[PDB]
Design a protein around this ligand. Structure first.
Ligand SMILES: CC1(c2cccc(Cl)c2)CCN(CCc2cnn(-c3nccc4c(=O)[nH]cnc34)c2)CC1
Ligand SMILES: [Cl-]
Ligand SMILES: [Zn+2]
Ligand SMILES: [Zn+2]
Length: 337
């Protein structure tokens, strides 16, 4: 993948059955170079039979997202609201005040998103501790991915739900500890995404530091606050390489270590997310620039199990390793030959 473009995968039931193995395969194809990838599950596969029974589910901390800014540069302020049900949320999402505008092409809804993001602050039913997967579903269960991340246990290994409405957005960020993430769109309107290849993440970081010097002087890793919104036109103007994709109901999105992403919701929808790891991530986690002011994992456990050679060297602070973002996960051995 020398273009480092967002790749889409259509695994067959046999390919899909093993998660970490498929993640290894996609990586062998160079999916990780984009920072983001799309996986379409086999037609037969459904994580839940019906999403009709979830009306009385509680969103405990709804956030009214207030955006301030101009000419492609913005800051999102999350005003916590009183707990509400999925029924209360769906009624607001679909109301004449908060419903999706009329549009033809996606290019139109995007244009409208970046014009109106500062007006009529929507509510986002974000970071809801729970799962919509049924107990019995073994393939790609966000609640139990059984990645090397489980070594921490031996609360970022838990799943979170997101109830979105038109114009609700997520700011530019990599995952905490520069981890991988899985995002499944359970039902509803699409979710649009923007991605910066990990090989260019430092150019986005540099750009963001230039625009928000107050923020940068206050916290080294200020993008981790998940408050910074940057227009694709601003990225294009400052020559930051990026790509866009639209995830539709019943699709999976994978974010890779140090793969900056941001996006917005088209209308009323629900998506489940969690973090996961591969052997590749261990150097990403060790090297990660964290938020000072303000999720932190002690790498020691991983460096003792997978890098025993470099353990005494790293503990000392002599492990001068340099991350190659083009390199696939060791696990992709069986798929690279
Ligand atoms: C609750 C926490 C304590 C604090 C929050 N943190 C997860 C934060 C996090 C990291 N990425 N990310 C997102 N990434 C991709 C997509 C979305 C999306 O559509 N909506 C919202 N957030 C998204 C959200 C979980 C632990
Ligand atoms: Cl327009
Ligand atoms: Zn994310
Ligand atoms: Zn901070």
């Amino acid at each position: 993948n020398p273009s480092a473009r967002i790749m889409t995968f259509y695994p067959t039931m046999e390919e899909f059955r093993n998660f970490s193995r498929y993640i290894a395969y996609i990586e062998s194809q160079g999916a990780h170079r984009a920072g983001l990838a799309k996986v379409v599950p086999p037609k037969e596969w459904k994580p839940r039979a019906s999403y009709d029974d979830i009306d009385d589910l509680v969103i405990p901390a709804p956030i009214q997202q207030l955006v301030t800014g101009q000419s492609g540069l913005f800051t999102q302020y999350n005003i916590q609201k009183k707990a509400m049900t999925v029924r209360e949320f769906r009624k607001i999402a679909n109301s004449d005040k908060y419903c999706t505008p009329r549009y033809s092409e996606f290019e139109e809804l995007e244009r409208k998103y970046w014009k109106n993001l500062t007006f009529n602050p929507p509510i986002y039913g974000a970071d809801v501790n729970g799962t919509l997967y049924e107990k019995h579903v073994d393939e790609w269960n966000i609640g139990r991915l059984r990645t090397i991340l489980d070594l921490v246990e031996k609360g970022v290994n838990t799943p979170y739900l997101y109830f979105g409405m038109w114009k609700t957005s997520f700011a530019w960020h990599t995952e905490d500890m520069d981890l991988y993430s899985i995002n499944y769109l359970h039902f509803g309107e699409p979710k649009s995404w923007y991605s910066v290849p990990p090989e260019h993440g430092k150019r986005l970081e540099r750009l963001a530091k230039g625009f928000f010097p107050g923020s940068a002087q206050s916290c080294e890793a200020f993008l981790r606050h998940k408050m910074t919104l940057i227009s694709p036109l601003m990225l294009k103007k400052y020559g930051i390489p990026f790509d866009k994709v639209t995830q539709e109901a019943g699709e999976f999105m994978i974010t890779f270590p140090y793969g900056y992403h941001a996006g917005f919701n088209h209308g009323f929808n629900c998506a489940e997310s969690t973090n996961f790891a591969t052997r590749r991530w261990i150097e990403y986690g060790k090297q990660a620039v964290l938020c000072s002011c303000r999720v932190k994992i002690s790498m020691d456990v991983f460096v003792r199990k997978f890098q025993p050679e470099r353990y005494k060297l790293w503990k000392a602070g002599k492990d001068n390793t340099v991350i190659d973002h083009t390199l696939p996960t060791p696990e992709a051995a069986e798929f690279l030959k």
